[PDB]
Design a protein around this ligand. Sequence first.
Ligand SMILES: [Cl-]
Ligand SMILES: [Cl-]
Ligand SMILES: [Cl-]
Ligand SMILES: [Cl-]
Ligand SMILES: [Mg+2]
Ligand SMILES: [Mg+2]
Ligand SMILES: [Mg+2]
Ligand SMILES: [Mg+2]
Ligand SMILES: [Mg+2]
Ligand SMILES: [Mg+2]
Ligand SMILES: [Zn+2]
Ligand SMILES: [Zn+2]
Ligand SMILES: [Zn+2]
Ligand SMILES: [Zn+2]
Lengths: 440, 439, 440, 439
Amino acid sequence: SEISRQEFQRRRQALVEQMQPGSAALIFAAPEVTRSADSEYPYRQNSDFWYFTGFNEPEAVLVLIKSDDTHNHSVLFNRVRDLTAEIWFGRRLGQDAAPEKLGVDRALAFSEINQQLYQLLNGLDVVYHAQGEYAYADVIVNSALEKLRKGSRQNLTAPATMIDWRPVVHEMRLFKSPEEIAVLRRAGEITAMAHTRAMEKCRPGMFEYHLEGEIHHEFNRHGARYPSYNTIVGSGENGCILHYTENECEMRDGDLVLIDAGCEYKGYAGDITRTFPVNGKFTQAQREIYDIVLESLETSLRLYRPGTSILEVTGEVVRIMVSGLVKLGILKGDVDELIAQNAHRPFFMHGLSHWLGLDVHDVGVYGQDRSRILEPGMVLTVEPGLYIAPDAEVPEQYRGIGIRIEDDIVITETGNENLTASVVKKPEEIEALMVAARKQ
Amino acid sequence: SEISRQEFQRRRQALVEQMQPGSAALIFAAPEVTRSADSEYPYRQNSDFWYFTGFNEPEAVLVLIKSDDTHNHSVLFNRVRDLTAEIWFGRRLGQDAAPEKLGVDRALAFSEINQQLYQLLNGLDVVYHAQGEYAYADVIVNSALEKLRKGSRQNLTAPATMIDWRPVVHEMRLFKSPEEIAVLRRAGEITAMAHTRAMEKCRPGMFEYHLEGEIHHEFNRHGARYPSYNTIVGSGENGCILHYTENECEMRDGDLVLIDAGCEYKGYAGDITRTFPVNGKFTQAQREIYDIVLESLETSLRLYRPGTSILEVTGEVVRIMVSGLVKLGILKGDVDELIAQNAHRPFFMHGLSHWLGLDVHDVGVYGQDRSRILEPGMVLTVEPGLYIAPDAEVPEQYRGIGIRIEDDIVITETGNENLTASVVKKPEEIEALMVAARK
Amino acid sequence: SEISRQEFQRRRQALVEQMQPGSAALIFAAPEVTRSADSEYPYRQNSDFWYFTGFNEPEAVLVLIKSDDTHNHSVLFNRVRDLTAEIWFGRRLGQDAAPEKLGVDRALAFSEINQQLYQLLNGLDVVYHAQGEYAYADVIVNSALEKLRKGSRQNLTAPATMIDWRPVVHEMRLFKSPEEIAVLRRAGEITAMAHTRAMEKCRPGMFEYHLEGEIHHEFNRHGARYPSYNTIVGSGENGCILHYTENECEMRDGDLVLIDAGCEYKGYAGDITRTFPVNGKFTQAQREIYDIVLESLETSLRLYRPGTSILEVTGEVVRIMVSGLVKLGILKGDVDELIAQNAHRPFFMHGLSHWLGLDVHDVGVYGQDRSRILEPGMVLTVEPGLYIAPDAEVPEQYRGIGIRIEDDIVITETGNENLTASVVKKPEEIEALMVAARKQ
Amino acid sequence: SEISRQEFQRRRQALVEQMQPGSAALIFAAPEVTRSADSEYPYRQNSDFWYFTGFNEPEAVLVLIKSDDTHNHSVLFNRVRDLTAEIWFGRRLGQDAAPEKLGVDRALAFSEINQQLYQLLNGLDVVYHAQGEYAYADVIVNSALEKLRKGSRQNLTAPATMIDWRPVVHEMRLFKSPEEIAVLRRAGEITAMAHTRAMEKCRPGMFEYHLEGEIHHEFNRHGARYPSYNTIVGSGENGCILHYTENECEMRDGDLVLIDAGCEYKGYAGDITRTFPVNGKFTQAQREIYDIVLESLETSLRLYRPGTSILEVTGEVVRIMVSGLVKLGILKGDVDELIAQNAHRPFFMHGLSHWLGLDVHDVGVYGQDRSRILEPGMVLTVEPGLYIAPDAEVPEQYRGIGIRIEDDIVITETGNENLTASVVKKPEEIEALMVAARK
Ligand SMILES: [Cl-]
Ligand SMILES: [Cl-]
Ligand SMILES: [Cl-]
Ligand SMILES: [Cl-]
Ligand SMILES: [Mg+2]
Ligand SMILES: [Mg+2]
Ligand SMILES: [Mg+2]
Ligand SMILES: [Mg+2]
Ligand SMILES: [Mg+2]
Ligand SMILES: [Mg+2]
Ligand SMILES: [Zn+2]
Ligand SMILES: [Zn+2]
Ligand SMILES: [Zn+2]
Ligand SMILES: [Zn+2]
């Protein structure tokens, strides 16, 4: 699945609809990023620029101009076609092909932006600009405005009002269209297949990075060349480190391994966590903690639907965790009092859910304590976990256990749809999957 | 292989030996780098900082202080141990463990650097600093020097002399030690195994990115988690684009595929290019161009040794290329006159060789036109290629062909050693490899 | 005369009246300015900050907050009282005395601005800020906004709209109140007295800077310690250089001297130019050029009134100049054709009039080609001049003559009032003044 | 007096003599400075740039290039002659006239500096640059060095060593030549005449700023158009504020007025303070404090000579002050114990002396606690004072009294010469001066 030309056009028009008449919106591409010396990281387009264009080049700026309630047009600044530069550093769209390819009215050379941008802004009332996003963009915009302010003798005038478009655009991105959901559905499927493979390939004596290798190979073979975030493969005590990415330890017989990994597919993030035994068999202690995390996830998946909130569902998860931990002797006392003093916090220190989209921790207002009421089209994660430190003062058999189970969901009219249910999470299904692979 | 504790110590002392007495050298870690929003790229340490420490954390500064010809010591600024920050964002070395782990005399918290750096620079004559390398570093150094300059009432004085250590350090990096050659040898072996795998897996109907996938999986399984540069898999007309990295096309029966890929193993880069037929059998036209590129490589591998230069070996390659292109009717005229007017340039527009090490395009002075005399311990690539554009005014059978063959070598006392010869390059050996894999 | 506490308060309220509800306006003081090494120039407050406060300290920020159409309040950030700093570098108002002295609701220490400003901006819809005016101010404002944008977990939100207040404030400053006119009337009088003194003191053999000395002494004795711009004393060929400020030549018998000088009185600028013979007697040639400039000035003074424009009056002056220059043989041809080709331009290359106020070249929109229709309360200069270069291809006796005569006026209901008419400009009155002084 | 062409040349050569071979020194003009909106303050050239050129334009850079021990030359970047710009904003020297006028070998347009500076720095070993002095200069120098560092393919190389010339130049400025002493002598005379005039014109009912007016008029009539610092006229309780410059109060019969004012003559600063009674007659209480300050000055003027230091002379002044204050009952106790606890500090909180020259607080190393040994050619102020706050817990008749007496001296082979002795300071001479003027 992919985003259509018509969809990119609908998005631009949805932004223009919200703009004041006599205004321009400026959306800048991400700069290229150095890895070491003259070598650069693989390019990642700015998510907001991507959202409106699907254009994966640096040194580009989309300018949407609204003259009035009926009249508007678009101008793209982008890199010129240069024979030498392209023979070396790959093909460029250029100005001639851009209008048809990207559906813009006019395309100009990025090298002319300082000579041209002020002419587009001249006489407008409002400029929409994400100030502070990129230094290079701020320099360009501020130079244009200073030329206008100082140009009264040349009959130039600057827009006196500057508005940050990020709140408006981020509210747009928070609600996914059917096309976006189709892409996310594919990202969830590719990511699930990778996690299934990792479970099937895992053996004691392999290093954590070997599972990272299997995962990335699986992403790649489905056309998702890059992960959406740095893959976490935390076995044994490494599972208690939330963003463990060193992945440098030999995986030991008797340990769990926690894998948090997600592909980026057409710009959209998958984000799945599975935890499983390195040797294919959960111990009683591992099983006891796993069951609490799994009940929390399964209950959350039943509960999430329009009209509730992350905060509300979190309250139900907290009760499940505290109750579970009291039965194991990890916490001691009255459940309601323990809940009241947030006694689960040492073992579950992060949020249950975040938005998901073009960024793995996606944009959009959560409300105070993530109390915002959920509506259809919102996409989020559900990721309960329990992390018991090696030095925790609890019964000894629980020490050094880190378990998280994370799925990705979309809120629908009546409930939710689980985009990542195709990789198993019940302990018996995990064990059966691993047994079958070890035959083969 | 690996770089030992003792080696890192030897490198630091070799720098200190070149410093003036009453001086300090400041070496800064790379900043973390945003990929998108709050997510960051996998961390890549600054090569110079890595060279002296083997320490893979940001927000760190190595300070080497030379009081006089016999007295010197080291101070590390690095991130403090913080229980919360580490539970979230991974373990940190901290101050207590750093002296023993990294072999430094003293370790201080990076958060204190502005309160402490000026105290270390106070009263010195010279500061060694790579000005302009990182903005955050320049801010820290300039703030320290300003405090000192303005602090005469507090009996503070600034060093009046600032020296860029990069020329000295880059000259050090240009000559590899035996330990570094052992690591580069392993990087070359891992990289060669990945290229062999790609040749064995290649089938028409696969996409270019599938071979990139096979290559990266092979790097990873040997403990090289990241490539040293973005992998190029250019099939058909994409082979004519030197740094083609989109890798987005379906590979077609009848085309060649050019793969330039290299692992990063313990910080050191492999850098290998192989070109081969997608269907396992070179056509006559493909073979005609391939043979010119291969002769260029084989001749270069015979010639490279102490006392010659990249410029000198390039001259021999240019003669091989022009002669070959004249025989095929791609160029027309007298070979010597064609050579004199650089008539090969449309088809071979890059250099034959670059230095290789902690960076794929490694540091070190080349001399004018890469005329520097080679000496033992230098590591470099040898990468002749011919790229005939789809619209080139040449016989049709040669249009749209891009071929490069690249090996990594070390200059020895008498010649060179080839670190990447374990992946095949003779056309009959390539074909035999692919036939065997397809059984 | 001076500006009352009540006037500063009226100005602040006039700005607040124009502000959107749920907004804050930020007005920053001028930074201190280095002259050499550790020594600084005498402090000059930012004109807009001065306009709203009459407060002559650096490191101060006025914040006007409008909650709604009826509720508003003011906060001042200013330097704290520090015993040591004040014993050295003079007295400071401080926080305790500021509310009563400056009529602000609340005063805070400037050293706390980064800890406090974001708290004032939190939850507002609009911030009014003159972006690009001062680097130090931009840093403060941008830091506050980034704290708010990034502080959603602490229930902080940034105003998404930023508006430049300069257009609004500069339109306010363009129209002078009766109190301001009274101050400008005094500035004009002090400046006129200085020009009269210079004429009376002038002798051949003095240096140009000696007249600058007399002028500055006269400003000072009336309580105007500083000039409003760098004094110009251009004798002989120096009179042809519009902003000649070297004032380094010995004044010669037979030359004219052009003096452009103005005091700054309570922040307001005088701006007068007189040209006169060093030896007290105009030659025929000097008189011939002087008469053209004087007719231009006198005609302009008759013409300026509500409903005309600088552009319109300039057209009448151009006709006077071209006609005059044709009769002298300086220009040759038909007057209307010469006017049509702007043939006066080599001899009169600057504008006839500029706004005057807290800045000598005062703020306010002029309109295209200074075509804006004049209204009561506007204050402007009238400064025709003719400058004939030493190498000009004209009759030889005119070469090297520079003459300008400049008065300051206020537009009134029926015409204008000349604020600088108390220094003479008719050639016979100039000569009589000088004769009388030489007795002284 | 004036500084000659030959002197500017001698100064440049004295800098070049201290430079390493294969180096360039870069000296930048001061930027223009905004007063309000489009209006600028009167231009004040950078003192170091002035010292080497006597050139009073912005957008200028002096480049001194030393090829070797015998070969050196100079390049000036300055504003081009532009007919329109000059008709408006005054005459410019330009490129054609600069070599002869300023004694430079070559002059280039400032607008070309980014196209030309890197070409001058190319291949040098050392650049002398005052980093951090001006932002515009740092941008120009950093851009040049970046072009060179990145320009190896164009056969460009950057100097790896950057040295701050300010320590060397400021040590030069610390020792005045005979020509400079002649200019400072004239500055002292002009300044003294202004102070005499202020004393003769002073009347009760005048405002403090009226005396500032008389002073500036006197500076101006002798060709010193600008003061070297903001004039202080502190009458009554304003005399206790060290840098009181508001000068806004009516001067009252019964008060003292403290005037600290100095002209700037050919770039050089006068710096004189005199305190005197507004009504022409010192009261007993005023005289009691005045006499302590005057004894301090007179003793300092006897003591200052080669081989002593500001610190050493300060010790004698402190004894005079404490002894005097004890006699008046302002301090109580044993003199030696009071001295040991610095009991004078509440009343005398600044230094006795600072260097004087192109800046009023001139450049040059003072040593710890101003302990540097004085040598011939150093120019400094001598400015004891006593400031008793209005709320000080001392006898009432001394509260709110601020007295300072300041002279400018040059250290000679055997002692010192007083450049400002032509304005009176003995109380009976002050009174006689004022009585005579009031007839
Ligand atoms: Cl471009
Ligand atoms: Cl830290
Ligand atoms: Cl403060
Ligand atoms: Cl120029
Ligand atoms: Mg996750
Ligand atoms: Mg390569
Ligand atoms: Mg073909
Ligand atoms: Mg004027
Ligand atoms: Mg003084
Ligand atoms: Mg008293
Ligand atoms: Zn997640
Ligand atoms: Zn290579
Ligand atoms: Zn004017
Ligand atoms: Zn002084």
